[PDB]
Amino acid sequence: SMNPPPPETSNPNKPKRQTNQLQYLLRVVLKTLWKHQFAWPFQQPVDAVKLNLPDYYKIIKTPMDMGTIKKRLENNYYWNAQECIQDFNTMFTNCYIYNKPGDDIVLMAEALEKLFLQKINELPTEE
Numbered sequence: 001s002m003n004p005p006p007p008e009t010s011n012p013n014k015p016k017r018q019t020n021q022l023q024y025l026l027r028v029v030l031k032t033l034w035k036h037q038f039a040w041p042f043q044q045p046v047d048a049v050k051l052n053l054p055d056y057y058k059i060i061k062t063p064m065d066m067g068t069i070k071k072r073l074e075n076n077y078y079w080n081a082q083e084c085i086q087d088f089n090t091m092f093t094n095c096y097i098y099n100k101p102g103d104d105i106v107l108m109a110e111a112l113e114k115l116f117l118q119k120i121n122e123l124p125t126e127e
């Protein structure tokens, strides 16, 4: 009963960049989702141990969560916005794959994904 190491949030060898799109992702997209009533189960890596989901990391081999995304943004881990958008999508997809439809957690992810899509609809053109 161990969790895996969480996804990296910094890497000495990975080129780093600030873009206006990455700024929007932190200041508008992540900020909006982070403070949502349904954010909290997504604010850190899935703790398969504490949540008693022993098969979680047998099924989900590409874990992701908003805690991780938040640190990546803050750390300037990403080169581009598409990397960050991909992380959000992974987090939602993992949830839909692992959990039963009608579980509360699935309803929560669906609400946050709708808001995410609303906010990324207006991602500004890059400068």
Ligand SMILES: CN1Cc2cc(S(=O)(=O)N3CCCC3)ccc2NC1=O
Binding pocket: 041, 042, 046, 051, 094, 095, 098, 099, 104, 105
């Ligand atoms: C992302 N999660 C975390 C999670 C949390 C929890 S719970 O029991 O904390 N809970 C019930 C709904 C609100 C939060 C249960 C399952 C998952 N599955 C994931 O897919």
